[PDB]
Amino acid sequence: AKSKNHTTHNQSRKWHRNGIKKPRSQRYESLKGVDPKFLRNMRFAKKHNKKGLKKMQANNAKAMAARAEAIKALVVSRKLHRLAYIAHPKLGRRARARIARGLR
């Protein structure tokens, strides 16, 4: 009783019924497999980013003034265009009313 050994016959149909989805790339991907020395130092950097917090607020409030002051320191046819202006509901309102104000 021999039988069929191997095929990949209906498989490309079955893979495409629910689709061959690309894997879900979202930002901030995981850090598994990165170099442990680099990751240990990165965790030390993240552990001490709060240390220079005063320099951040000092330079942030200083950069706010030096740019917020710097912003205000120196500061197709005569038929079809005209009909598109008259038949515009908000632009051609008084000019549309002028037709009746002549038509009386």
74 binds other proteins (CB under 8 A): no
Least distance between RNA and beta carbon 68 (Å): 14
Residues 82-101 that bind other proteins (CB under 8 A): none
32: Cβ contacts below 8 Å, ≥ 6 apart: none
96: Cβ contacts below 8 Å, ≥ 6 apart: 86, 87
* Cβ atoms of residues 81 and 91 within 8 Å: no
3 binds Mg ion (CB under 5 A): yes
Residues that bind RNA in the complex, under the rule CB under 7 A: 1-14, 26-33, 35-37, 39-40, 42-44, 46-47, 84, 87-90, 93
